[PDB]
Amino acid sequence: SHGLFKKLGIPGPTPLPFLGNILSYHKGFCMFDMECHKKYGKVWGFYDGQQPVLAITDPDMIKTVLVKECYSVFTNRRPFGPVGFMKSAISIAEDEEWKRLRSLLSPTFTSGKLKEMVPIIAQYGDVLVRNLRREAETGKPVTLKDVFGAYSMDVITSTSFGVNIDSLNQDPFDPFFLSITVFPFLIPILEVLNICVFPREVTNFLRKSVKRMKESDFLQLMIDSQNKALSDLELVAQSIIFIFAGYETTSSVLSFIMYELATHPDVQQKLQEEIDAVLPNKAPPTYDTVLQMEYLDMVVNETLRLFPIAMRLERVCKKDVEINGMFIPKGVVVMIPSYALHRDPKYWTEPEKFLPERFSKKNKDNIDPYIYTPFGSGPRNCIGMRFALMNMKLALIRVLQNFSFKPCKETQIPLKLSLGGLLQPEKPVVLKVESR
Ligand code: HEM
Ligand SMILES: CC(C)(C)OC(=O)N[C@@H](CS[C@H](Cc1ccccc1)C(=O)NCCc1cccnc1)Cc1ccccc1
């Protein structure tokens, strides 16, 4: 089984018995992907253990995979376990079951459901300020992910359920998952053991805490179809997904943006200037004033080009296909190396520099949406994209209407990415905060 790509004529690095190419992850997914993209061109293959993985980078082939042939051939992501009752979570679910959850949960993030959440988000930003005004009136460097995650947790639990809890001081969220991929034949062993990559105690906290809400929103819109069709432990699982997403991703990106705003002071001023012009007198941001702000959008986009928190997009090939003139056999994992495409010199001038002018309306048309895919694409892209962009931007507006951000002696400059598996910084993001 380590001969597949040698036979297909697809180039790629030579695998070791059993491990495949996984020793190559010692420097991280993204470095390996960049290295392959440059050694091998537009297409290559490698092996996670015994699992063949075909990397593609052609914009047309990517659109075919994410969009043109999604329902028919590339419907699911790579199996990932042991998951337990979380198998029914939307982003883990497969084929017809995912289809049903997608259709069931899509009405949560409309322009009209988002627009109802702006008045309610508007409270925790003010908490976020006062929490920050304290750690500022005392010239003590601030950990952004702590105070951002605090605010993120606040918005999520209320956007979907209705629970309000000053997020300060709950909040429960590469050593072993390694063995999953040399030993994925061990996943079904672990499922029959109830063994879970979510420690059985974090989920047991909510295997009742959702039943405990309450009862007598995302939570609302689910019961209406609970009363085919719908369930309830399946309701707790969707909730856990949403609660992770809104906490960890929203807070992690906010921290990346503030780092870049701090290492590029002219961009921070330019942004504070735009916010005060749309929102004079520190006017409260509304749903519409957020979408009005173009440089805020450019800043956000440009951070997600540098720090795309998914790193790779993946789809299981569920049957033989010949896409854009190339044969792909059943079972291959097809992979888009997003981090690499975001930093590819053959699309982006000076790709390591934080330059938000790449996304000006003057320039944003030179940007292939199948190269720059921070939220995915096609029927299976990020279901929370608009809620996420809006959530962050309201945090940013409120925050920058009050404070500026400078580097500190301990600010890691330049910021190293974690060689681990998740797009995080090695050292946490600390910066000096000053009150306008
Ligand atoms: C800046 C924040 C976020 C980013 C960059 C992001 C990005 C992504 C990406 C790249 C995917 C995979 C798409 C694909 O494979 O084509 C995804 C999937 C998903 N995201 Fe997010 N996301 C963010 C925040 C959120 C939030 C706040 C939610 C809240 C519900 C959310 C819910 C989901 C779900 C449910 C999926 C699975 C979609 C499916 O399998 O049908 N995401 N996200
Ligand atoms: C750990 C590793 C990076 C190797 O592979 C995973 O990423 N595996 C997840 C399985 S689930 C799903 C998948 C996903 C999401 C975004 C991009 C690519 C793949 C998911 O939407 N997750 C919920 C929150 C979220 C995160 C990012 C963007 N949008 C939403 C990790 C996971 C498992 C169980 C609970 C929470 C997270």
Short mmCIF file of C-alpha atoms and ligand atoms in Angstrom, two decimals:
data_model
loop_
_atom_site.label_atom_id
_atom_site.label_comp_id
_atom_site.label_asym_id
_atom_site.label_seq_id
_atom_site.Cartn_x
_atom_site.Cartn_y
_atom_site.Cartn_z
CA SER A 1 0.00 0.00 0.00
CA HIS A 2 2.94 2.46 0.00
CA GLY A 3 3.17 2.08 -3.80
CA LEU A 4 0.02 3.98 -4.80
CA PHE A 5 1.55 7.30 -5.79
CA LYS A 6 4.65 5.69 -7.35
CA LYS A 7 2.22 3.82 -9.63
CA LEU A 8 -0.03 6.81 -10.36
CA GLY A 9 3.04 8.83 -11.40
CA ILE A 10 2.50 11.46 -8.68
CA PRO A 11 5.74 12.71 -7.06
CA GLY A 12 6.32 12.92 -3.34
CA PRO A 13 8.67 12.11 -0.49
CA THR A 14 9.61 8.51 0.07
CA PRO A 15 7.65 6.79 2.89
CA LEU A 16 9.07 4.65 5.70
CA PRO A 17 7.49 1.26 6.45
CA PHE A 18 4.49 1.71 8.81
CA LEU A 19 5.11 5.36 9.69
CA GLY A 20 4.65 6.60 6.14
CA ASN A 21 6.03 10.15 6.02
CA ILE A 22 5.03 11.16 9.51
CA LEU A 23 8.58 11.70 10.78
CA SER A 24 8.45 14.75 8.41
CA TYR A 25 6.07 16.46 10.87
CA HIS A 26 8.96 17.19 13.27
CA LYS A 27 8.99 20.80 11.99
CA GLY A 28 5.18 20.97 11.70
CA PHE A 29 2.48 20.34 9.08
CA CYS A 30 2.91 23.74 7.54
CA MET A 31 6.69 23.67 7.01
CA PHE A 32 6.39 20.16 5.49
CA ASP A 33 3.58 21.36 3.23
CA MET A 34 5.57 24.42 2.12
CA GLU A 35 8.59 22.20 1.54
CA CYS A 36 6.57 19.73 -0.55
CA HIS A 37 4.84 22.49 -2.51
CA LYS A 38 8.27 23.74 -3.56
CA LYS A 39 10.09 20.39 -4.13
CA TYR A 40 7.16 18.91 -6.09
CA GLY A 41 4.91 21.54 -7.70
CA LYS A 42 1.12 21.64 -8.00
CA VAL A 43 0.36 18.05 -6.85
CA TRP A 44 2.11 15.55 -4.57
CA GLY A 45 1.40 12.56 -2.39
CA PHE A 46 2.50 11.33 1.02
CA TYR A 47 1.37 8.84 3.64
CA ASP A 48 0.06 9.33 7.16
CA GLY A 49 1.03 5.90 8.41
CA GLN A 50 -0.55 3.72 5.70
CA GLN A 51 -3.14 6.37 4.67
CA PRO A 52 -2.35 8.02 1.28
CA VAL A 53 -2.93 11.78 1.21
CA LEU A 54 -3.00 13.66 -2.12
CA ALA A 55 -2.16 17.37 -1.89
CA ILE A 56 -3.65 19.56 -4.63
CA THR A 57 -3.09 23.26 -5.33
CA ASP A 58 -4.68 23.98 -8.73
CA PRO A 59 -7.53 26.52 -8.21
CA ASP A 60 -9.75 24.62 -10.69
CA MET A 61 -9.09 21.22 -9.12
CA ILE A 62 -9.74 22.76 -5.68
CA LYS A 63 -13.07 24.20 -6.80
CA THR A 64 -13.99 20.80 -8.25
CA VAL A 65 -13.21 19.13 -4.94
CA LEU A 66 -14.67 21.61 -2.45
CA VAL A 67 -17.67 22.55 -4.65
CA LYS A 68 -18.35 20.91 -8.03
CA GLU A 69 -18.16 17.33 -6.72
CA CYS A 70 -18.82 17.74 -2.99
CA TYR A 71 -22.22 16.04 -2.61
CA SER A 72 -21.18 13.22 -4.98
CA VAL A 73 -17.58 12.29 -4.11
CA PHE A 74 -15.90 14.52 -1.52
CA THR A 75 -18.58 14.79 1.12
CA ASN A 76 -16.70 13.97 4.32
CA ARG A 77 -13.56 14.82 6.19
CA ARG A 78 -10.92 12.36 7.29
CA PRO A 79 -12.17 9.96 10.00
CA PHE A 80 -11.10 11.16 13.43
CA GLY A 81 -11.47 9.22 16.64
CA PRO A 82 -12.26 7.95 19.14
CA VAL A 83 -15.17 10.40 19.38
CA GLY A 84 -18.00 8.55 21.18
CA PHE A 85 -21.42 10.25 21.24
CA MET A 86 -19.73 13.15 19.42
CA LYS A 87 -19.88 11.14 16.17
CA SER A 88 -23.19 12.89 15.62
CA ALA A 89 -21.61 16.37 15.80
CA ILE A 90 -22.20 18.22 12.56
CA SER A 91 -18.58 18.70 11.52
CA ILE A 92 -17.80 15.01 12.21
CA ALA A 93 -21.00 13.60 10.70
CA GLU A 94 -20.99 12.03 7.25
CA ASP A 95 -23.03 11.83 4.08
CA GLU A 96 -26.80 11.91 4.63
CA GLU A 97 -26.58 12.48 8.37
CA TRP A 98 -24.40 15.58 7.94
CA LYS A 99 -26.76 16.78 5.18
CA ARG A 100 -29.65 16.67 7.66
CA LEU A 101 -27.70 18.50 10.39
CA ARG A 102 -26.47 21.11 7.91
CA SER A 103 -30.04 21.78 6.73
CA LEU A 104 -31.26 21.77 10.32
CA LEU A 105 -28.62 24.17 11.67
CA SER A 106 -28.14 26.53 8.72
CA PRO A 107 -30.91 29.03 9.75
CA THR A 108 -28.85 29.89 12.83
CA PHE A 109 -26.46 32.21 10.97
CA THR A 110 -28.62 34.31 8.69
CA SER A 111 -28.26 38.05 8.30
CA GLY A 112 -31.48 38.38 10.32
CA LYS A 113 -30.43 36.05 13.15
CA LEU A 114 -27.01 37.70 13.34
CA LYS A 115 -28.66 41.13 13.41
CA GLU A 116 -30.65 40.12 16.51
CA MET A 117 -27.34 39.19 18.24
CA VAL A 118 -25.74 42.65 17.84
CA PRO A 119 -27.77 44.23 20.70
CA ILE A 120 -26.80 41.30 22.95
CA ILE A 121 -23.11 41.13 22.03
CA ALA A 122 -23.05 44.86 22.82
CA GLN A 123 -22.86 44.10 26.56
CA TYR A 124 -19.80 41.88 26.84
CA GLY A 125 -17.62 44.28 24.87
CA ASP A 126 -18.14 46.77 27.69
CA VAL A 127 -17.17 44.08 30.19
CA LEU A 128 -14.16 43.47 27.93
CA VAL A 129 -13.26 47.16 28.19
CA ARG A 130 -13.61 47.49 31.97
CA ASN A 131 -11.76 44.21 32.49
CA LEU A 132 -9.04 45.81 30.34
CA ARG A 133 -9.22 49.26 31.89
CA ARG A 134 -8.19 47.60 35.18
CA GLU A 135 -5.21 45.68 33.77
CA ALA A 136 -4.32 48.97 32.03
CA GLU A 137 -4.61 51.51 34.88
CA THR A 138 -2.00 49.18 36.41
CA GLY A 139 0.90 49.20 33.92
CA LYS A 140 0.94 45.38 33.93
CA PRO A 141 1.27 43.55 30.56
CA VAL A 142 -1.91 41.71 29.51
CA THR A 143 -2.40 38.17 28.23
CA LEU A 144 -4.77 38.69 25.35
CA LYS A 145 -5.99 35.12 24.95
CA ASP A 146 -7.07 35.12 28.59
CA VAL A 147 -9.16 38.28 28.34
CA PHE A 148 -10.28 37.60 24.75
CA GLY A 149 -11.32 34.03 25.58
CA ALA A 150 -13.16 35.39 28.60
CA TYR A 151 -15.20 37.64 26.29
CA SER A 152 -15.58 34.94 23.61
CA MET A 153 -16.98 32.46 26.14
CA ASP A 154 -19.45 35.15 27.20
CA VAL A 155 -20.81 35.79 23.69
CA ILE A 156 -21.07 32.11 22.81
CA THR A 157 -23.00 30.90 25.86
CA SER A 158 -25.51 33.71 25.38
CA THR A 159 -25.77 33.72 21.56
CA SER A 160 -26.90 30.12 21.61
CA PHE A 161 -28.42 29.37 25.04
CA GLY A 162 -29.07 32.55 27.02
CA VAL A 163 -26.67 32.16 29.97
CA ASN A 164 -24.78 35.21 31.27
CA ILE A 165 -21.66 34.76 33.41
CA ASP A 166 -18.91 37.34 33.86
CA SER A 167 -16.11 35.36 32.21
CA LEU A 168 -13.19 35.94 34.58
CA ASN A 169 -12.67 33.56 37.51
CA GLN A 170 -16.00 27.34 34.36
CA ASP A 171 -14.61 27.50 30.82
CA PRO A 172 -13.58 23.89 30.34
CA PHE A 173 -12.07 22.94 26.97
CA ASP A 174 1.23 16.14 19.58
CA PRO A 175 1.77 13.18 22.04
CA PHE A 176 -0.96 10.58 21.45
CA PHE A 177 -2.94 11.63 18.36
CA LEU A 178 0.33 10.70 16.68
CA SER A 179 -0.38 7.05 17.46
CA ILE A 180 -3.85 7.45 15.88
CA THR A 181 -2.28 7.69 12.46
CA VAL A 182 0.19 4.88 12.71
CA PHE A 183 -2.58 2.98 14.46
CA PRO A 184 -5.97 4.15 13.07
CA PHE A 185 -6.87 0.49 13.18
CA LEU A 186 -6.96 1.19 16.93
CA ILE A 187 -9.74 3.78 16.80
CA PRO A 188 -12.46 1.02 16.71
CA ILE A 189 -10.69 -0.57 19.67
CA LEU A 190 -10.99 2.71 21.54
CA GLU A 191 -14.65 3.26 20.59
CA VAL A 192 -15.62 -0.01 22.26
CA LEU A 193 -13.75 1.24 25.35
CA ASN A 194 -15.71 4.51 25.60
CA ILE A 195 -12.20 6.04 25.43
CA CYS A 196 -12.52 9.58 24.13
CA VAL A 197 -10.23 12.34 22.81
CA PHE A 198 -12.56 14.65 24.77
CA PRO A 199 -11.82 13.44 28.32
CA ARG A 200 -15.06 11.79 29.45
CA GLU A 201 -15.26 14.37 32.28
CA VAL A 202 -15.37 17.56 30.18
CA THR A 203 -18.29 16.19 28.14
CA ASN A 204 -19.98 14.63 31.20
CA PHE A 205 -19.96 18.18 32.58
CA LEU A 206 -22.36 18.93 29.73
CA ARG A 207 -23.87 15.47 29.05
CA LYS A 208 -26.09 17.00 31.72
CA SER A 209 -25.29 20.77 31.61
CA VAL A 210 -27.28 21.08 28.37
CA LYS A 211 -30.14 18.98 29.71
CA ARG A 212 -29.56 21.46 32.57
CA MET A 213 -30.48 24.40 30.24
CA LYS A 214 -33.01 23.81 31.19
CA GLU A 215 -35.76 24.07 30.48
CA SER A 216 -39.08 25.75 31.28
CA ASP A 217 -31.38 30.91 20.03
CA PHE A 218 -29.33 28.02 18.66
CA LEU A 219 -30.74 26.04 21.59
CA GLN A 220 -34.22 27.31 20.71
CA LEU A 221 -33.99 26.54 16.97
CA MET A 222 -33.02 22.92 17.84
CA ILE A 223 -35.94 22.07 20.15
CA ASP A 224 -38.40 23.29 17.49
CA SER A 225 -37.26 20.31 15.42
CA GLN A 226 -36.90 18.03 18.46
CA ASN A 227 -40.52 18.16 19.74
CA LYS A 228 -36.52 12.70 9.97
CA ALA A 229 -35.63 14.52 11.98
CA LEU A 230 -33.87 15.38 15.24
CA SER A 231 -32.78 14.11 18.65
CA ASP A 232 -31.43 15.31 22.00
CA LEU A 233 -28.05 13.79 22.76
CA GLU A 234 -27.54 14.89 19.17
CA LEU A 235 -28.55 18.33 20.42
CA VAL A 236 -25.86 18.34 23.15
CA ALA A 237 -23.22 17.40 20.55
CA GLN A 238 -23.99 20.32 18.22
CA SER A 239 -23.92 22.57 21.27
CA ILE A 240 -20.42 21.40 22.25
CA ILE A 241 -19.17 22.11 18.70
CA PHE A 242 -20.60 25.62 18.73
CA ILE A 243 -19.26 26.32 22.21
CA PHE A 244 -15.74 25.32 21.24
CA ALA A 245 -15.78 27.22 17.95
CA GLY A 246 -17.06 30.48 19.44
CA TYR A 247 -14.59 30.35 22.35
CA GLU A 248 -11.30 29.01 21.05
CA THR A 249 -11.28 30.22 17.46
CA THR A 250 -12.72 33.70 18.11
CA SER A 251 -10.28 34.32 20.96
CA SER A 252 -7.29 32.85 19.13
CA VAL A 253 -7.78 35.03 16.08
CA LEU A 254 -8.44 38.17 18.10
CA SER A 255 -5.06 37.61 19.77
CA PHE A 256 -3.32 37.21 16.40
CA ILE A 257 -4.88 40.49 15.15
CA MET A 258 -3.76 42.46 18.19
CA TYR A 259 -0.19 41.15 17.80
CA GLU A 260 -0.10 42.36 14.19
CA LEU A 261 -1.73 45.68 15.13
CA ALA A 262 1.01 46.08 17.78
CA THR A 263 3.97 45.23 15.53
CA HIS A 264 2.55 47.60 12.83
CA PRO A 265 1.50 50.84 14.62
CA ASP A 266 0.48 52.74 11.42
CA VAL A 267 -2.09 50.04 10.72
CA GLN A 268 -3.48 50.40 14.24
CA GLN A 269 -3.83 54.16 13.84
CA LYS A 270 -5.39 53.86 10.38
CA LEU A 271 -7.94 51.50 11.94
CA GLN A 272 -8.66 53.73 14.95
CA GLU A 273 -9.20 56.59 12.48
CA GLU A 274 -11.80 54.66 10.47
CA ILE A 275 -13.76 53.56 13.57
CA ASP A 276 -14.00 57.11 14.90
CA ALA A 277 -15.26 58.37 11.52
CA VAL A 278 -18.06 55.79 11.15
CA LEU A 279 -18.72 55.85 14.92
CA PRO A 280 -18.20 59.39 16.25
CA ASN A 281 -18.10 60.02 20.02
CA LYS A 282 -17.32 56.32 20.54
CA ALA A 283 -20.80 55.69 19.17
CA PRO A 284 -21.98 52.09 19.78
CA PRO A 285 -21.28 49.83 16.79
CA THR A 286 -24.34 48.54 15.00
CA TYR A 287 -24.67 45.59 12.64
CA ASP A 288 -24.57 47.95 9.68
CA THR A 289 -21.72 50.19 10.87
CA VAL A 290 -19.61 47.01 11.20
CA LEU A 291 -20.14 46.05 7.55
CA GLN A 292 -19.45 49.65 6.56
CA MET A 293 -15.86 49.49 7.86
CA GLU A 294 -13.56 48.44 5.01
CA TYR A 295 -10.08 48.68 6.57
CA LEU A 296 -11.33 46.68 9.54
CA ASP A 297 -12.29 44.00 7.05
CA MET A 298 -8.89 44.29 5.34
CA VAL A 299 -7.08 43.92 8.65
CA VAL A 300 -9.13 40.91 9.63
CA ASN A 301 -8.67 39.22 6.25
CA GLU A 302 -4.96 39.85 6.24
CA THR A 303 -4.46 38.24 9.65
CA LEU A 304 -6.35 35.15 8.51
CA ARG A 305 -4.09 34.98 5.45
CA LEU A 306 -1.06 34.79 7.75
CA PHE A 307 -2.67 32.68 10.51
CA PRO A 308 -5.30 30.43 8.86
CA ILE A 309 -6.41 28.47 11.88
CA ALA A 310 -7.49 25.39 9.85
CA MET A 311 -4.01 25.07 8.15
CA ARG A 312 -5.26 22.28 5.81
CA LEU A 313 -8.64 21.47 4.28
CA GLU A 314 -9.32 17.76 3.64
CA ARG A 315 -12.00 15.54 1.98
CA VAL A 316 -12.22 11.75 1.69
CA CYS A 317 -12.51 10.52 -1.89
CA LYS A 318 -15.50 8.20 -1.68
CA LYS A 319 -15.27 6.63 -5.18
CA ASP A 320 -13.02 6.61 -8.25
CA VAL A 321 -12.95 9.97 -10.06
CA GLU A 322 -11.01 11.81 -12.76
CA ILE A 323 -11.03 15.51 -11.80
CA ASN A 324 -9.38 18.08 -14.09
CA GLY A 325 -7.64 15.36 -16.07
CA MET A 326 -6.25 13.39 -13.10
CA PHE A 327 -7.37 10.01 -11.73
CA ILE A 328 -8.00 9.79 -7.95
CA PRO A 329 -8.69 6.32 -6.49
CA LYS A 330 -11.19 5.49 -3.79
CA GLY A 331 -10.08 6.13 -0.24
CA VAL A 332 -7.37 8.74 -0.90
CA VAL A 333 -7.53 11.79 1.34
CA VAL A 334 -7.46 14.93 -0.79
CA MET A 335 -5.84 17.86 0.98
CA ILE A 336 -5.64 21.59 0.34
CA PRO A 337 -2.55 23.02 2.08
CA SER A 338 -4.15 26.38 2.92
CA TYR A 339 -1.32 27.68 5.08
CA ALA A 340 1.04 27.02 2.17
CA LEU A 341 -1.20 28.57 -0.47
CA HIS A 342 -1.58 31.66 1.77
CA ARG A 343 2.26 32.04 1.86
CA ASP A 344 2.99 30.94 -1.75
CA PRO A 345 5.20 33.57 -3.49
CA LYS A 346 3.54 32.61 -6.83
CA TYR A 347 0.35 34.49 -5.68
CA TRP A 348 1.32 36.99 -2.96
CA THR A 349 4.03 39.61 -3.19
CA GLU A 350 6.14 39.60 0.01
CA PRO A 351 3.91 36.86 1.46
CA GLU A 352 5.41 36.93 4.99
CA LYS A 353 4.61 40.63 5.51
CA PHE A 354 1.40 41.81 7.15
CA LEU A 355 0.08 44.11 4.40
CA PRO A 356 -3.68 44.75 4.62
CA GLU A 357 -3.63 46.72 1.33
CA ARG A 358 -3.66 43.34 -0.47
CA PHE A 359 -7.40 43.29 0.32
CA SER A 360 -8.28 46.87 -0.68
CA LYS A 361 -11.07 47.08 -3.23
CA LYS A 362 -8.33 48.42 -5.52
CA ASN A 363 -6.44 45.11 -5.14
CA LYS A 364 -8.86 42.46 -3.75
CA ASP A 365 -9.69 41.27 -7.31
CA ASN A 366 -6.18 39.81 -7.81
CA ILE A 367 -7.03 37.22 -5.13
CA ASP A 368 -8.16 33.74 -6.15
CA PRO A 369 -10.91 32.64 -3.71
CA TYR A 370 -9.74 29.05 -4.23
CA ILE A 371 -6.25 30.00 -3.09
CA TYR A 372 -7.36 32.16 -0.12
CA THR A 373 -9.86 30.04 1.79
CA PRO A 374 -9.74 30.89 5.51
CA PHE A 375 -13.35 29.64 5.96
CA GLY A 376 -13.28 26.75 3.46
CA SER A 377 -15.54 26.63 0.43
CA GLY A 378 -18.50 24.78 -1.04
CA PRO A 379 -21.43 23.14 0.77
CA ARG A 380 -19.13 22.19 3.62
CA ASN A 381 -17.47 25.49 4.48
CA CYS A 382 -17.48 27.17 7.87
CA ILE A 383 -21.06 27.42 9.03
CA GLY A 384 -20.19 30.18 11.49
CA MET A 385 -18.28 32.47 9.16
CA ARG A 386 -20.58 35.50 9.28
CA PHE A 387 -21.19 35.10 13.01
CA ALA A 388 -17.42 34.83 13.54
CA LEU A 389 -16.40 37.88 11.44
CA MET A 390 -19.15 39.89 13.12
CA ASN A 391 -18.30 38.68 16.61
CA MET A 392 -14.62 39.63 16.25
CA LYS A 393 -15.21 42.97 14.55
CA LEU A 394 -17.56 44.12 17.34
CA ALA A 395 -14.86 43.14 19.81
CA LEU A 396 -12.24 45.08 17.82
CA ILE A 397 -14.38 48.23 17.33
CA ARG A 398 -15.25 48.48 21.03
CA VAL A 399 -11.66 47.68 22.06
CA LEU A 400 -9.92 50.12 19.73
CA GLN A 401 -12.38 52.91 20.59
CA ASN A 402 -10.66 52.92 24.01
CA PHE A 403 -7.15 51.46 24.04
CA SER A 404 -3.95 51.25 22.04
CA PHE A 405 -1.55 48.29 21.97
CA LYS A 406 2.26 48.35 22.09
CA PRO A 407 4.93 45.65 22.30
CA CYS A 408 6.38 44.73 25.67
CA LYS A 409 9.85 43.55 26.66
CA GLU A 410 8.44 40.02 26.78
CA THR A 411 6.45 40.18 23.51
CA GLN A 412 7.79 37.37 21.32
CA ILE A 413 8.93 39.19 18.17
CA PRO A 414 8.86 37.64 15.66
CA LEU A 415 6.07 35.36 16.79
CA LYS A 416 6.92 31.67 16.32
CA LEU A 417 4.13 29.33 15.34
CA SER A 418 3.60 26.26 17.48
CA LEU A 419 5.27 23.27 15.82
CA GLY A 420 2.42 21.32 17.39
CA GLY A 421 -0.73 20.51 15.49
CA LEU A 422 -2.95 23.53 16.05
CA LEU A 423 -2.25 27.00 14.69
CA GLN A 424 -1.14 28.60 17.93
CA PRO A 425 1.89 30.66 18.96
CA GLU A 426 4.65 28.97 20.93
CA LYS A 427 4.66 31.74 23.58
CA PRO A 428 1.34 33.43 24.49
CA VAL A 429 0.59 36.92 23.20
CA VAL A 430 1.41 39.61 25.78
CA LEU A 431 1.39 43.33 25.01
CA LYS A 432 1.29 46.69 26.74
CA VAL A 433 -2.16 48.32 26.78
CA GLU A 434 -2.63 52.11 27.05
CA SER A 435 -5.83 54.10 27.57
CA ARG A 436 -6.89 56.67 24.97
C1 HEM B 1 -12.39 33.20 12.85
C2 HEM B 1 -13.09 32.13 13.25
C3 HEM B 1 -13.29 30.84 12.39
C4 HEM B 1 -12.61 30.35 11.32
C5 HEM B 1 -11.35 30.93 10.63
C6 HEM B 1 -13.26 29.13 10.88
C7 HEM B 1 -12.90 28.31 9.83
C8 HEM B 1 -13.48 27.10 9.49
C9 HEM B 1 -13.00 26.23 8.44
C10 HEM B 1 -11.77 26.54 7.56
C11 HEM B 1 -13.79 25.16 8.39
C12 HEM B 1 -13.66 23.97 7.42
C13 HEM B 1 -14.33 24.41 6.11
C14 HEM B 1 -14.01 23.48 4.97
O1 HEM B 1 -13.48 22.35 5.20
O2 HEM B 1 -14.30 23.89 3.80
C15 HEM B 1 -14.80 25.32 9.41
C16 HEM B 1 -15.81 24.45 9.69
C17 HEM B 1 -16.82 24.69 10.59
N1 HEM B 1 -16.96 25.77 11.41
FE1 HEM B 1 -15.66 27.36 11.61
N2 HEM B 1 -14.35 28.93 11.69
C18 HEM B 1 -14.39 29.95 12.62
C19 HEM B 1 -15.34 30.10 13.60
C20 HEM B 1 -16.46 29.32 13.76
C21 HEM B 1 -17.52 29.58 14.70
C22 HEM B 1 -17.61 30.79 15.68
C23 HEM B 1 -18.43 28.62 14.57
C24 HEM B 1 -19.72 28.61 15.44
C25 HEM B 1 -20.71 27.76 15.18
C26 HEM B 1 -17.98 27.70 13.53
C27 HEM B 1 -18.60 26.54 13.09
C28 HEM B 1 -18.10 25.64 12.16
C29 HEM B 1 -18.70 24.38 11.80
C30 HEM B 1 -20.00 23.80 12.39
C31 HEM B 1 -17.95 23.81 10.87
C32 HEM B 1 -18.20 22.47 10.16
C33 HEM B 1 -18.99 22.75 8.87
C34 HEM B 1 -19.52 21.41 8.34
O3 HEM B 1 -18.81 20.38 8.53
O4 HEM B 1 -20.66 21.32 7.77
N3 HEM B 1 -16.76 28.16 13.07
N4 HEM B 1 -14.59 26.52 10.07
C1 LIG B 2 -6.66 18.29 15.45
C2 LIG B 2 -6.57 18.45 13.92
C3 LIG B 2 -6.13 19.92 13.59
C4 LIG B 2 -5.50 17.50 13.34
O1 LIG B 2 -7.87 18.11 13.29
C5 LIG B 2 -9.06 18.73 13.63
O2 LIG B 2 -9.20 19.96 13.43
N1 LIG B 2 -10.15 18.08 14.17
C6 LIG B 2 -11.35 18.83 14.59
C7 LIG B 2 -12.54 17.86 14.34
S1 LIG B 2 -14.21 18.69 14.27
C8 LIG B 2 -14.44 20.08 12.99
C9 LIG B 2 -13.25 20.03 11.96
C10 LIG B 2 -12.60 21.25 11.35
C11 LIG B 2 -12.92 22.56 11.68
C12 LIG B 2 -12.23 23.62 11.07
C13 LIG B 2 -11.21 23.39 10.14
C14 LIG B 2 -10.88 22.08 9.81
C15 LIG B 2 -11.58 21.04 10.42
C16 LIG B 2 -14.96 21.37 13.82
O3 LIG B 2 -15.80 22.15 13.28
N2 LIG B 2 -14.70 21.67 15.19
C17 LIG B 2 -15.30 22.76 16.03
C18 LIG B 2 -14.78 24.19 16.15
C19 LIG B 2 -14.25 24.85 14.98
C20 LIG B 2 -12.87 24.97 14.81
C21 LIG B 2 -12.30 25.60 13.70
C22 LIG B 2 -13.21 26.14 12.78
N3 LIG B 2 -14.54 26.01 12.95
C23 LIG B 2 -15.05 25.39 14.01
C24 LIG B 2 -11.19 19.35 16.12
C25 LIG B 2 -12.38 19.35 17.15
C26 LIG B 2 -12.99 18.16 17.57
C27 LIG B 2 -14.05 18.16 18.50
C28 LIG B 2 -14.51 19.34 19.07
C29 LIG B 2 -13.90 20.54 18.69
C30 LIG B 2 -12.85 20.54 17.74
#
